[PDB]
Write a protein that binds this DNA or RNA. Sequence first.
RNA 1: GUUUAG
Length: 94
Amino acid sequence: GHHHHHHMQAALLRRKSVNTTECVPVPSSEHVAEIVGRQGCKIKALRAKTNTYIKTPVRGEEPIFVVTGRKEDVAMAKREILSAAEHFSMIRAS
RNA sequence: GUUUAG
């Protein structure tokens, strides 16, 4: 709800425990789809696991996630997104 | 043996 959004922005403004925001590109919206999962189940699990705010890109726009949180947490979420994107490329590529 | 949540 709005409480979560407001508190998230307040945490960014303190720049204590949340201190990093990074763009994480993947090759295509099809990659985005498989990384996010149905109903966003996989990207929501990733946010929970890494304690990160993640913005999923809209289909048809640039397939680039934005990941925000503690530096080491953003690095873990970025690692998992990029590894997932490479996974789907390796197993789907013709 | 995966295919877009707020």
